[PDB]
Amino acid sequence: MAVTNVAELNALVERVKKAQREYASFTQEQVDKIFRAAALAAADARIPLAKMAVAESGMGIVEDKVIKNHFASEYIYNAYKDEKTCGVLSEDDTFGTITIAEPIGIICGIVPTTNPTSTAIFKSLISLKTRNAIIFSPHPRAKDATNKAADIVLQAAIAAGAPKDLIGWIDQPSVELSNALMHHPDINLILATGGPGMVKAAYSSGKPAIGVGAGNTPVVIDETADIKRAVASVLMSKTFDNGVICASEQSVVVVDSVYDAVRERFATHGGYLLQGKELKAVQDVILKNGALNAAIVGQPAYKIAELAGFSVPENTKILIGEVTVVDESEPFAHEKLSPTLAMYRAKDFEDAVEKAEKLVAMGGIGHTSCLYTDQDNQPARVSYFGQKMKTARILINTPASQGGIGDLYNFKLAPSLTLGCGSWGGNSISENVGPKHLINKKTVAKRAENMLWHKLPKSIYFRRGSLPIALDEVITDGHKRALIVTDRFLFNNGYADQITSVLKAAGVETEVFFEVEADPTLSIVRKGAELANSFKPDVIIALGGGSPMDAAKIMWVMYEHPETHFEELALRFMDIRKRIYKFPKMGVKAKMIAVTTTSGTGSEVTPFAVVTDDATGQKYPLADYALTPDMAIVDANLVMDMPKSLCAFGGLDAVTHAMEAYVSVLASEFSDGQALQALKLLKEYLPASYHEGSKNPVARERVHSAATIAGIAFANAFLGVCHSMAHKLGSQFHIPHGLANALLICNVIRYNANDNPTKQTAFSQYDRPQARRRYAEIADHLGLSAPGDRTAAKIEKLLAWLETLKAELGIPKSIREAGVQEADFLANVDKLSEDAFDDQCTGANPRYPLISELKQILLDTYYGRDYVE
Amino acid sequence: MLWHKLPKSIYFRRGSLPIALDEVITDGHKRALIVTDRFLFNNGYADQITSVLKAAGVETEVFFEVEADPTLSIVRKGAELANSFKPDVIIALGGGSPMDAAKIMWVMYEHPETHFEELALRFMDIRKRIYKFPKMGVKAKMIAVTTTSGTGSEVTPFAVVTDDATGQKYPLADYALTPDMAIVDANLVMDMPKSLCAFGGLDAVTHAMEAYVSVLASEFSDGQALQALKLLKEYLPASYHEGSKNPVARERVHSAATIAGIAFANAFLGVCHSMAHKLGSQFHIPHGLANALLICNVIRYNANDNPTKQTAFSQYDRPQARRRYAEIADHLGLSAPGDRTAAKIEKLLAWLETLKAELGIPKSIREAGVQEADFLANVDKLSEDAFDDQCTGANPRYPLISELKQILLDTYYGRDYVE
Amino acid sequence: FSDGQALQALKLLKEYLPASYHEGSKNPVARERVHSAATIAGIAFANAFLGVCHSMAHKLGSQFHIPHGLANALLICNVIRYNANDNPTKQTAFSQYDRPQARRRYAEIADHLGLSAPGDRTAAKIEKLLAWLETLKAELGIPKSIREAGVQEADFLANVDKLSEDAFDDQCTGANPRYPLISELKQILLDTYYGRDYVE
Numbered sequence A: 001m002a003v004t005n006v007a008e009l010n011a012l013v014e015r016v017k018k019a020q021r022e023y024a025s026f027t028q029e030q031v032d033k034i035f036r037a038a039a040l041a042a043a044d045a046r047i048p049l050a051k052m053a054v055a056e057s058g059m060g061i062v063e064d065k066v067i068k069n070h071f072a073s074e075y076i077y078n079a080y081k082d083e084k085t086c087g088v089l090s091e092d093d094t095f096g097t098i099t100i101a102e103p104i105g106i107i108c109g110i111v112p113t114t115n116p117t118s119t120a121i122f123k124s125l126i127s128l129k130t131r132n133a134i135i136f137s138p139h140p141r142a143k144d145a146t147n148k149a150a151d152i153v154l155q156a157a158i159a160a161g162a163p164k165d166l167i168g169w170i171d172q173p174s175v176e177l178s179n180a181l182m183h184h185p186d187i188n189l190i191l192a193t194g195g196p197g198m199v200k201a202a203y204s205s206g207k208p209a210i211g212v213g214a215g216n217t218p219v220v221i222d223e224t225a226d227i228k229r230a231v232a233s234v235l236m237s238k239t240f241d242n243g244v245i246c247a248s249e250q251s252v253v254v255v256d257s258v259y260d261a262v263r264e265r266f267a268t269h270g271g272y273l274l275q276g277k278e279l280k281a282v283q284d285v286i287l288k289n290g291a292l293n294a295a296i297v298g299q300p301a302y303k304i305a306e307l308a309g310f311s312v313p314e315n316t317k318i319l320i321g322e323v324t325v326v327d328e329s330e331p332f333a334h335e336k337l338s339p340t341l342a343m344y345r346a347k348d349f350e351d352a353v354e355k356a357e358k359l360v361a362m363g364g365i366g367h368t369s370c371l372y373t374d375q376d377n378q379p380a381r382v383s384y385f386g387q388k389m390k391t392a393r394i395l396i397n398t399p400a401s402q403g404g405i406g407d408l409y410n411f412k413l414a415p416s417l418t419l420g421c422g423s424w425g426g427n428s429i430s431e432n433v434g435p436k437h438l439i440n441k442k443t444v445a446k447r448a449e450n451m452l453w454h455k456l457p458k459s460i461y462f463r464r465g466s467l468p469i470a471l472d473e474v475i476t477d478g479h480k481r482a483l484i485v486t487d488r489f490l491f492n493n494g495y496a497d498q499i500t501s502v503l504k505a506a507g508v509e510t511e512v513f514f515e516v517e518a519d520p521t522l523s524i525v526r527k528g529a530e531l532a533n534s535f536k537p538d539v540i541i542a543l544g545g546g547s548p549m550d551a552a553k554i555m556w557v558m559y560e561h562p563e564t565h566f567e568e569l570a571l572r573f574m575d576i577r578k579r580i581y582k583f584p585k586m587g588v589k590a591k592m593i594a595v596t597t598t599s600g601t602g603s604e605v606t607p608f609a610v611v612t613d614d615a616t617g618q619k620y621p622l623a624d625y626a627l628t629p630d631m632a633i634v635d636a637n638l639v640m641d642m643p644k645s646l647c648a649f650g651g652l653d654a655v656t657h658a659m660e661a662y663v664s665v666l667a668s669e670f671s672d673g674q675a676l677q678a679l680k681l682l683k684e685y686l687p688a689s690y691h692e693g694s695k696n697p698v699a700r701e702r703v704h705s706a707a708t709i710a711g712i713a714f715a716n717a718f719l720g721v722c723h724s725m726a727h728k729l730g731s732q733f734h735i736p737h738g739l740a741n742a743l744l745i746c747n748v749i750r751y752n753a754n755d756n757p758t759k760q761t762a763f764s765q766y767d768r769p770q771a772r773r774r775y776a777e778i779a780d781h782l783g784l785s786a787p788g789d790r791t792a793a794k795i796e797k798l799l800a801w802l803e804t805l806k807a808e809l810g811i812p813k814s815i816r817e818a819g820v821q822e823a824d825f826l827a828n829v830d831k832l833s834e835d836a837f838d839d840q841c842t843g844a845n846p847r848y849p850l851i852s853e854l855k856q857i858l859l860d861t862y863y864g865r866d867y868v869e
Numbered sequence B: 001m002l003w004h005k006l007p008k009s010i011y012f013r014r015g016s017l018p019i020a021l022d023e024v025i026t027d028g029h030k031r032a033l034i035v036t037d038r039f040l041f042n043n044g045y046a047d048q049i050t051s052v053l054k055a056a057g058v059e060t061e062v063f064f065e066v067e068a069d070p071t072l073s074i075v076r077k078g079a080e081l082a083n084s085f086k087p088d089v090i091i092a093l094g095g096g097s098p099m100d101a102a103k104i105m106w107v108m109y110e111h112p113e114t115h116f117e118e119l120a121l122r123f124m125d126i127r128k129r130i131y132k133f134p135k136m137g138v139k140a141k142m143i144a145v146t147t148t149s150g151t152g153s154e155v156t157p158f159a160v161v162t163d164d165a166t167g168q169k170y171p172l173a174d175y176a177l178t179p180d181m182a183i184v185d186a187n188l189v190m191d192m193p194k195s196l197c198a199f200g201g202l203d204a205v206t207h208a209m210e211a212y213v214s215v216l217a218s219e220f221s222d223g224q225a226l227q228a229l230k231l232l233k234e235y236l237p238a239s240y241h242e243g244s245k246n247p248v249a250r251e252r253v254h255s256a257a258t259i260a261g262i263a264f265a266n267a268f269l270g271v272c273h274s275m276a277h278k279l280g281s282q283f284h285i286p287h288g289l290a291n292a293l294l295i296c297n298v299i300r301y302n303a304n305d306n307p308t309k310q311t312a313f314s315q316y317d318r319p320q321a322r323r324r325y326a327e328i329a330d331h332l333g334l335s336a337p338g339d340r341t342a343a344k345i346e347k348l349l350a351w352l353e354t355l356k357a358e359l360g361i362p363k364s365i366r367e368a369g370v371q372e373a374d375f376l377a378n379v380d381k382l383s384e385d386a387f388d389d390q391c392t393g394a395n396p397r398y399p400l401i402s403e404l405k406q407i408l409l410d411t412y413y414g415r416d417y418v419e
Numbered sequence C: 001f002s003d004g005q006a007l008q009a010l011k012l013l014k015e016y017l018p019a020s021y022h023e024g025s026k027n028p029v030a031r032e033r034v035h036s037a038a039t040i041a042g043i044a045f046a047n048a049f050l051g052v053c054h055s056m057a058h059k060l061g062s063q064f065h066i067p068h069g070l071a072n073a074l075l076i077c078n079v080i081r082y083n084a085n086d087n088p089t090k091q092t093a094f095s096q097y098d099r100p101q102a103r104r105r106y107a108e109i110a111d112h113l114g115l116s117a118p119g120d121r122t123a124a125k126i127e128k129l130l131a132w133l134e135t136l137k138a139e140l141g142i143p144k145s146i147r148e149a150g151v152q153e154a155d156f157l158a159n160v161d162k163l164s165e166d167a168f169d170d171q172c173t174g175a176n177p178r179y180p181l182i183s184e185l186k187q188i189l190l191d192t193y194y195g196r197d198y199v200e
């Protein structure tokens, strides 16, 4: 039963550990009942413990401890009784979160002599609500009391449905014993108290800790204060337990304006101002051996002077010494737990808090500070006192001894002894301790599918003869200044009068910018914003496709936000809503209506805008749904006179826009029927549009509509990896986009079409690799294989249809065959296989390629081979 | 000429709602109104969005006073509230009756001068409209959540309401009152009853079956209609029987119903929604149940290569309806190789009966709680007033009042529509 | 029961109401004590109903849309001169009320607030009381009559007999200590319009 040896300890802990494991399986009602019985047993025993605390400690006063043994039970209960601390605290079912709050284990309670019983009723009683255990290592001066404070708690818990040794205490303490308890393995936490050396040794143990320092507690009394209650509260805080209590106001800092008044008001109401010889004698007994006399602590005032060598009335509550030094040389400013007090003299407020912060900074860093002022009309002072004072508790118009243990003067403050002083003091709690610190929360995280979107430009218009019907719809009914962006071949050949012809004839002012060439550079973009910033357009228009529709919707940026650094605008990301350079909201200065005369790109719907740096020459595909065209237009009358090449490269980038959008990882049921309806039109009408041309406008139109439909697909289901390398392959060699996508898709499919790949994209919605299947759902949709095929022929037949399609469009079989030299390829292939993996298009490819696996399907194309793996 | 216009945002996955308000509402607005029905105010569905707004600097107000087949009395009631709270955003919720009522309150809030009769005016085209609707993005935006899987009102301009005086649902329409955002999360329909997952998920079958065949049908609004049809075939039965026990199906169907809205918002409905609206406001039959009884005949109606009339649309040169209804089956698998374009429809209609039998759908209107005396007496009314609905100005054979009644009756007596 | 509360509602409205007007939120204690007083008076007049000032006020503040408190501040300084007549025309016929004591109660009020000097005669304690109101109505922005309160002499005299007969028909007046005559109400309506007194 008794504990004065190191083995008795190692036995106790075990018969305790085994209580917890039996106590942890308890419910809320089975412990809500243990919590009361232990709190009553502690309240009804408020007087005796307070007697047993003075007989043994030699300090304190009875009637002021009784407010503590009682506060530590009633004011603890009213607060932590309804705190759900057993199981599920919260359950957000929209998400998949649940907080379950298992306990922590067992604890070591390091008790002081200052508050031996309250600090025990407080910990004992709070460690039962969290379904924990605890073991006390008390102070020799108060071992009999704080251990009689737990038996009065335990013997009332076991009587309420608890085990019989859940709690434990050391009877004959030491260092060899505590240091053997704090370092015990079956312990799981340390709940300490007692100032420096204590917390310096709690954390240093090896276990966690909620140790708690302590020290000075400056209090400031400004001109705009109620010097009456400022003083009573100063005395009601020192004399309370004779200041032995922590946080008590060891030092006031008054401003000259009201010092004399305060000086007297302290005198009449039991204040002896240490004027001369008395003072020195008093600041000589305080500090013994660099520390405060351990015999003066908690003792009444008149009992101070006797040790000093003088005498004062027995009714004196306090001993005040008017001083100026605010450093360590003055022992009259350290953490004297006596009723003594230091009275400083300051010019104004700012001169005080500068002085307070200086003497909290010496012994009481982080604990608490106080202020007395107009709590309602001087909120800036407050704001200036909280932002300047490095204390975890700033107590405005409250006494510290009864506001730091806070449920009396202020609510919303966690009632507690064991007041955290923040890392400033050497403890990482920063708050009044409670049961939510003795607790191991834990979070079950159900798989949540990542949110998706089908976002387009409103006002898509599509048929032959749709320009004037559209401009005169939403543009002219509205804006007044336009900026048509296009290329020369369209400005020269009357593709841009067909649009000004309509704006003119109404009130509008046009200005065309036609210095855009294939693969636009950032130099052309600036030059376009440099113009937009002069013409100040109310709207922006973009013709052709790709180069214009990619230079314009970015010129739309530099016009509304010229501070945009392309280096940050083209930063590769991992998710498009968790973007690190969130695009600015740009639809205010001007809109970005878009027209297209080129089939494939589909840029008229999608956020993508491919441009190159003009310094490194790397195409930086940059993406955000803020640069959607805002009323795209797609008229098939601007395509019927296209050459045979641009038709192929276009309609053949659209194929690889849907192919790697039906198979992508962001694919959905919204973007999977459009991709197919595109891929089914590019099969019935694409060859015709190449051979026949304008002679079959029915086909030249569908292809134009399809290539846009893919946009609806790959605007939401981003591209795959064929573009991540086609952008680099089409830059280091100036190969066109569509021609590059054609030389890879018949080797990229068979890359992604492995159900046992080396990697995978880590997308929640992506259960497992479906690409091999997601590619056969294509063939069966086109009509390649009806009868019961292996799912591997449906692919061979998909490729075959491509090699057949790439044949009847003049597409070469390889790059070598496309105007590239093995000497210039092998050299800068490792460079653009890395710069491909670092593209934003590849973050959606189902297989998450390895640099060592793009290089291979990048050589196998130069030599017209097949990636076999 | 044609178009394909929708909101500039359609967020859709289980758990998207907070991730559709934590994103956009609070980034732009601080005064929100919510429109719904009592079942959702009560059952804690509207405090799934007020939770996340109030947590921000937003002030909410909920107009929970909506009823099935909404009236113009409620609409004017919510405007008074909207005129008092002065919202920066409107958030419709509940599906259909609320959504169809909030986007019209949006009107009476932006422009209280309006007169409902000038909105319910049928027309020959949407551009060549006499009452050009006003611009509505200036006072408050309009969000649209949904809790049913059969309407598509999240995307479409259709806003069906009732005068409360004549009792005539006026399926008015204009893209100016499309929502700015549409949120379709299955978190809200997992616990939906069977009487709704059937009617709702079975109108959607029409939203898409008289949209892939309509004259305004385009390549844009044909793959979506189909994808809304290949999902309502593999997941609608399961979402009825298994219910929440197959949330993937109860989710895919929820997206399909919306995808069909991506279709019939661009390619208007045909004739089943004209006779439905009038046949479901008189006899107070629900929407989806009026569409499931007729669709299996309207097909037999529109699938006549030699009808009396076409709808006179340039893009529609020859009647192709008998063909489109075949590509449907050819896409769903009902079709066997070596057919003749006449059985693919039988194999299609066969898939519906098979689908209407396994959802609790009757075989006629008589079985649906309508007395032969209350029908034949007012059939010529809803047969002349269907012709006067805006939805029928898009179906491919411009029905005759001679020919509508005949299919009303053949759906009462469970008969077919031979000709 | 309802006499110490009424008074405590009156010793606080005298030491803290002026300060809560001028200083406003800069003296929240007064802006607080006054808030409690107003309620303590509710602890009184909930049990001991109002008199006649709230009858004429309600009718005089619904016709001319004058606020409640402003209709009560213009009249109270006369109703006192009315109820403080030891020999009125009528009493309110209440058993607990044997003799008219109103001229006396209004003195214990002053005697409690300090307005009274030792050696008075029960006739000045009321003057010293009314003097405290004017002094209090002048320092809150309260006018000296109804005319100054935005009411045209033509719109008043034309409908005075209405609100003078309809005040008598209010429930509040069935508790004041001298059962006013319609002859006597109008006279104090008008003397509050022309800022005059209510001699008799």
Ligand SMILES: NC(=O)c1ccc[n+]([C@@H]2O[C@H](COP(=O)([O-])OP(=O)(O)OC[C@H]3O[C@@H](n4cnc5c(N)ncnc54)[C@H](O)[C@@H]3O)[C@@H](O)[C@H]2O)c1
Pocket: A110, A111, A112, A113, A114, A115, A137, A138, A139, A140, A173, A174, A175, A178, A179, A193, A194, A195, A196, A197, A198, A201, A212, A213, A214, A215, A245, A246, A247, A335, A417, A418, A419, A420
């Ligand atoms: N912030 C609070 O909650 C609070 C409350 C009351 C008192 N206090 C502070 O407590 C202190 C009271 O003085 P005390 O009574 O703590 O005297 P003290 O500071 O000597 O406390 C010594 C305690 O340390 C324990 N201990 C265990 N292992 C130790 C080790 N390795 N090295 C040193 N000590 C070890 C001893 O058992 C003993 O109880 C003051 O600083 C007072 O401000 C803080």
Ligand SMILES: NC(=O)c1ccc[n+]([C@@H]2O[C@H](COP(=O)([O-])OP(=O)(O)OC[C@H]3O[C@@H](n4cnc5c(N)ncnc54)[C@H](O)[C@@H]3O)[C@@H](O)[C@H]2O)c1
Pocket: A487, A489, A517, A518, A519, A520, A544, A545, A546, A547, A548, A550, A597, A598, A600, A601, A602, A603, A604, A606, A607, A608, A609, A610, A638, A639, A641, A642, A643, A646, A723, A727, A736, A737
């Ligand atoms: N954002 C997207 O949606 C997306 C996706 C993939 C690729 N891209 C980018 O799109 C760009 C492709 O641009 P494009 O290839 O679409 O055209 P392009 O911009 O290369 O220029 C095509 C050239 O063909 C000629 N031309 C254009 N329209 C014509 C017409 N109607 N009749 C006759 N000649 C005509 C002009 O000389 C024009 O410069 C590449 O930079 C590619 O990376 C964009």
Ligand SMILES: [Fe+3]
Pocket: A601, A653, A654, A656, A657, A723, A737, A741
């Ligand atoms: Fe492309």
